[PDB]
Every structure is written in structure tokens, then in C-alpha cells.
């Protein structure tokens with residue numbers, strides 16, 4: 001009998017830190033006697049670098065495909081500024097829009113994306129800052145500088161997060177103002193009313209509750225923005241990915257302190273205590289151990305990049321068929337009563353804002369699945385039920401209780417009625 | 431890519447792996463078995479490690495290929511042999527039909543799409559408020575006012591036509607933002 | 618008199634002749650990215666996360682007249698043309714930047730990378746007397 005609007009958030013991992021390893025510097029950093037034996041293999045480091053380059057190329061292709069899916073078939077107006085935006089039919093979109101024309105220049109994200117990126121340190125710019133703060137004495141024992149001094153460094157993606165934020169802002173604006181490219185040319189309130197009516201709600205209560213829908217949307221946006229202050233299930237995934245990457249990097253770096261059966265794990269003592277003829281065996285054992293570790297690492301990276309490819313394909317599908325258009329598939333974008341979905345920029349992925357139809361109060365009403373009218377003809381409802389009010393059969397919606405007269409727009413005609421249909425010869429085609 | 435993988439796998443056979451040479455002929459013709467055992471064992475270990483890396487890369491590649499082939503099978507089932515109401519799946523929104531052709535190590539898809547050539551600027555309304563607290567809304571189109579008369583036109587082609595029952599929806603009430611027009615007696 | 622780390626490394630000591638305390642840190646070590654064109658005579662150099670002054674005073678010992686500070690690092694043998702944009706590149710350096718080669722100053726151009734754009738229309742945004750302006754084919 002009464003309903004509201006609920007909002008939900010969802011994060012899907014799309015990108016990944018592009019890790020590049022200098023095999024020669026990782027094994028034989030500053031020792032010529034080590035290089036004289038590492039060149040006796042060569043192809044190990046060659047194949048490691050080749051696999052890393054292939055993974056980086058796959059990541060770049062994935063990012064390009066995501067950008068293409070975000071910026072596919074978008075048409076905006078030239079006279080569209082930030083000041084003359086962020087409000088449509090009493091619905092505020094200030095926390096979801098940025099600036100893409102006659103407006104801000106260098107990197108400037110929306111408040112929601114700002115709150116998202118402020119909770120994550122190792123972002124696309126965090127690695128760059130930590131790498132450029134190595135020279136100067138800012139940090140004493142920073143782990144990233146130590147990894148960089150051993151040939152392990154992370155490269156930034158080919159597209160910065162500013163371009164992704166701009167694409168997301170453009171895709172969001174494409175559904176708020178004419179010509180409504182993201183809504184197939186349908187205005188926002190009319191599209192929302194159509195999506196709500198598609199669930200079995202009459203149009204009268206939707207036309208008489210124009211302000212309630214806007215109030216519910218604003219309340220849902222405010223609730224999401226307030227809940228993002230804490231650590232929900234969506235924000236924890238980015239932290240888990242960052243922690244897993246850091247743990248993998250630390251486990252790879254700790255391989256330089258193992259002896260692998262040698263007298264010491266450091267080449268300084270081996271070269272300052274024994275002769276090269278007595279040190280070649282230890283150097284070869286250390287090289288074999290480090291090469292085995294690097295092979296295990298690149299295999300794990302291949303598995304991870306395959307999983308990330310699958311996740312990014314899923315994310316691209318959801319962006320194409322839940323955000324830019326309304327797909328007639330149930331339980332795909334939301335949970336049964338899906339209405340609208342929005343996209344936002346997130347570290348190493350995207351953020352989805354799903355709006356659903358949530359009732360508040362119910363009512364026990366006796367319904368009928370069909371009536372046998374006069375003349376031996378069948379009548380069955382279309383996404384509704386037949387209710388009897390004051391000894392008269394009426395019609396009501398499946399998702400909302402609203403009696404209305406029976407017409408040709410809600411029933412189907414049959415030349416024969418079922419035996420399990422209630423006999424009602426007193427009612428005719430009104 | 432396949433050729434480069436095969437080339438690398440073949441060139442891996444010319445590495446010494448710390449031995450005196452990369453060929454077994456010279457090792458067997460120069461040294462005795464008690465001294466060639468270690469060299470042969472190191473070569474065998476290196477070649478086995480290379481083969482393990484190669485088969486792991488092949489497993490990853492065949493996983494990716496199976497994923498792509500599943501995507502292709504879904505696309506063939508939902509775009510070529512049938513018309514799906516899914517938007518932005520078989521094309522760019524204006525997709526009409528698709529055809530499949532045999533291709534080396536894959537398939538070739540031929541997609542036909544709707545592409546306009548000319549445009550013109552008109553004034554439209556999201557809805558109209560009829561007389562008697564009645565409201566109407568266009569279905570896959572807009573409302574245009576031509577010669578002091580409200581008409582209907584499509585969203586992908588400009589072709590005015592009179593308002594009918596199959597083109598609009600009927601409501602028991604009209605919104606406040608709908609333009610009032612009580613002269614539309616087209617019930 | 619010696620400060621050790623959890624892994625057994627020397628990170629500090631105390632001198633005996635002067636009773637002073639110091640701290641030992643490893644010296645800098647890194648790589649260099651070379652963007653080389655097909656028929657070029659010299660590639661472009663990029664020292665990621667390094668200033669041009671530090672490279673010229675500690676690393677670079679070769680006379681290089683072309684140098685400027687960028688977001689990624691010190692770029693050598695290239696000009697600063699970030700105001701120009703392109704739609705496709707073969708040498709992507711990162712963070713939305715690219716290096717373009719001009720057929721014959723340095724023949725390399727350091728520009729931005731914008732692979733996707735949005736179409737614009739001259740229609741209005743607000744209601745023109747209660748009606749919207751939509752272009753119909």
C-alpha cells in the first residue's frame with residue numbers, strides 16, 4: 001500500500017597496478033661476477049620481461065575497452081555548464097557531476113569520487129608520489145623505494161583517473177539533459193515513472209507522488225554519501241586488493257635474503273671471502289632460486305590478470321546493459337525491483353549506484369486468477385489481480401493496491417474459460 | 431604470437447645452463463660419463479623448467495581463448511540466429527541484424543546499423559494535459575505542434591502523423607508540467 | 618656500536634674516534650625508458666620520478682640541450698607541447714601522455730592522449746517557452 005526508494009552500492013575490480021620487474025637488477029644488481037653468470041642464461045630474464053610486457057598490454061587493452069564502453073555514443077550540448085546543472089525535477093546531482101566544458105581545467109573530481117580516493121593511499125598518484133619522494137630524504141625506510149632500488153617498480157596506466165572521471169561525468173549528464181542520449185530520448189522523470197510502472201504500479205499514484213520520488217532519491221543519495229564515511233563492503237574490496245598487492249611485493253622482495261643452501265644470502269660476503277672459482281656455485285644456486293621465485297610470481301600474475309580480465313568483462317557488460325540503457329532482464333542489474341543504475345569512478349574499478357523499489361506497508365487482499373464471463377469466454381489479468389469490492393469485480397496492480405475498473409488494457413480475451421475460474425455473469429465489458 | 435612462442439621454445443635449447451656447452455655431442459665426445467652426468471642433469475633441469483613455463487603459459491592462453499569462444503557462442507546465439515531486445519549488445523544501439531562467416535581461428539561478424547544523414551531542430555513536449563484532468567504521453571516519439579495543432583512524430587525520423595490510441599497512453603490524471611491543450615478531441 | 622635491521626643489514630653505526638652517530642642508506646638505482654621511432658636516429662629519454670637537475674648533476678654526464686620537467690619525470694630530446702592533443706598513439710608513456718614523432722629542434726613531440734571525445738550540439742538546455750529542442754533525423 002505504500003512504498004519508498006532504496007539505494008545500494010557495488011564495486012567491481014577493473015584495473016590493476018602495472019608491476020614491472022628488472023630481472024637483471026633483481027638478480028645481479030651491482031655485481032659484475034654475477035652478471036657474467038646471469039648472461040649464461042639470459043633467456044630467463046628475457047621471458048620474464050616478455051610476460052610482464054604482455055600483462056601490461058592486456059591491462060592497457062582492458063582500460064581502453066572500458067573507456068570505449070563508457071564513452072560510446074554520447075551526445076551533449078555545447079551550452080552546458082556546471083552552474084546550469086546538478087538539478088532536474090527537484091533531484092540534486094551535485095555530488096555526482098564535475099566539469100567538462102567552459103569550466104574547470106586540470107584534475108578535479110566529484111565530491112563522491114573525492115571521498116572515495118581520499119580513503120585509499122596507494123592510488124594512481126600515490127605510487128608516483130611515493131616514487132618521486134625517494135630522492136630528497138623525505139622517508140628513511142620506505143618499502144617502495146627499497147623495492148625500486150632492487151628492480152621492482154609500478155608504472156602508471158596509460159589513462160589517468162581524471163579522464164575516467166570525465167567520461168563518467170559525461171555519461172551521467174547524458175541522462176539528465178536533452179537529448180537524453182543515455183535514456184533513448186526519454187526525460188528523467190518520465191523514464192523513472194515508466195520503470196516503476198513496469199513493475200505493476202498504476203500511473204495515478206505515480207503522477208500524484210512526483211515530489212515523493214524526488215525526496216526519496218535525495219534521501220537515498222544522502223544515505224549513501226553518509227555511509228561511505230565508514231568502511232562498507234564496497235570500500236573494503238579496494239583495500240583488500242591493495243593489501244594483497246603489497247603482500248605479494250613484500251613476499252617477492254623477501255626472496256633476496258634466502259641462502260638456498262649457500263654460505264650466505266649476500267653477495268658481498270661471498271665475494272669478499274672466497275674466490276670466483278669457489279663462489280660460482282653459490283652464485284648459481286642463488287640465481288636458480290631467484291629465477292624460480294620470479295617464475296612463480298609471473299605465473300601468479302598471469303592467473304590474477306586472467307581473473308581481472310573476467311571481472312572487467314563482467315563490469316563492461318553491466319555498464320553497457322544497466323547504465324546506458326534499460327535492459328528487460330530481471331535480477332541482473334538489481335534485485336527484482338530494479339529501476340535505475342548509475343556509474344561512478346573508483347580506484348582500480350568502477351562504482352555502481354542501484355536504485356530499487358521497496359514497499360513499506362502491505363495488506364491482505366483476496367485475489368482471483370481469472371473469471372468466466374457470460375457467453376463462455378475467458379478473461380485473465382495482465383500483471384495484476386481480480387479483486388471484488390462491494391460485490392463488484394475490480395482490478396488492481398501486483399506491486400500496489402489501487403482498485404480500478406476493468407478495461408481492455410488490463411485483461412486478455414479467450415474464446416473459452418477455464419473450469420477453475422470463478423463464475424461472474426453479472427460483470428461485462430465496462 | 432604463436433610463432434614467437436615456438437621460436438623462444440626452440441632457442442631455449444641452445445642455452446648452456448652453466449655447463450661447458452649447449453650440445454650433448456661435444457659433452458659426450460670430450461668428457462666421461464662420471465663428469466658429464468652433472469652437465470646432462472643441469473641441461474635436463476633447465477629444459478624441464480622451460481617446458482613447465484611453456485605449458486603454464488599455454489594453460490593461461492587456452493583459458494582466455496575458451497572465455498572468448500564462450501562470448502562468441504553467446505553472440506552467435508543472441509544476435510545472428512535470433513533478434514534479442516538487448517540494447518548495446520549486438521551493436522551500438524541502432525543494430526538491425528548480424529551475419530556470421532568462417533574465419534581463420536575464429537568467426538567474422540557483419541553488423542548492419544541505422545545511420546541518419548540529415549537533422550533538423552524542432553520543439554517537442556514530454557506530455558500534454560487533455561481536458562477533464564486527463565494526461566497522455568508519447569510512445570517512442572514526441573509531440574509536435576504544426577499549424578496550431580498537436581501531432582505525433584517518431585524519435586528516429588521526422589514524420590508528423592495524427593495522434594491515435596496506439597501511439598499514446600491514457601492516464602486518469604495529468605502532471606503539472608504537462609502543456610494544457612483541451613482542443614485535442616482525438617479520443 | 619652497530620645498528621642492525623630485522624634482516625641483518627647495516628642501517629647505522631657509532632664511530633669510536635669521535636663518538637658520532639650516523640645512518641647508512643643505499644644509493645639511488647633505476648632504469649630509463651627509451652621511446653624510439655621506426656626510422657629515427659636517436660630515441661627519447663624519460664627518467665621517471667626524477668628531476669632534470671638531479672639527473673644532470675648526478676646521473677647524466679652527456680651534453681643534452683633538450684630537457685624539461687614533466688609529470689612523469691625528466692624528458693630528454695623532446696619539446697613541451699602538452700597544449701596539443703591527439704586521438705591515437707604508438708608510444709604511450711602513461712597518465713594520459715604520449716610522444717609523437719614529426720617528420721623533419723627535436724623531432725619528438727610530447728603531447729597529451731585523448732582517444733575518445735563526445736559530440737556536441739548547438740541546441741538549448743533549458744525549456745524554450747515550455748518546450749525542449751530536439752534534433753530529429
Ligand SMILES: *[C@@H]1O[C@H](CO)[C@@H](O)[C@H](O)[C@H]1NC(C)=O
Pocket residue numbers: 419420421
Ligand atoms: C481446479 O483444478 C483442480 C485440479 O486441476 C481440480 O481438482 C478442481 O476440481 C478444479 N476446480 C474446479 C472448480 O473445476
Ligand SMILES: *[C@@H]1O[C@H](CO)[C@@H](O)[C@H](O)[C@H]1NC(C)=O
Pocket residue numbers: 633634635636
Ligand atoms: C668517546 O667515549 C668514550 C667513552 O665515554 C671515551 O672514553 C672517549 O674519550 C670518547 N671520545 C671522544 C673523542 O670524546
Ligand SMILES: *[C@@H]1O[C@H](CO)[C@@H](O)[C@H](O)[C@H]1NC(C)=O
Pocket residue numbers: 703704732733734
Ligand atoms: C574523436 O575521437 C575519434 C575516434 O578516436 C577521432 O577519430 C576524432 O578525431 C576525435 N575528435 C577530435 C576532435 O580529436
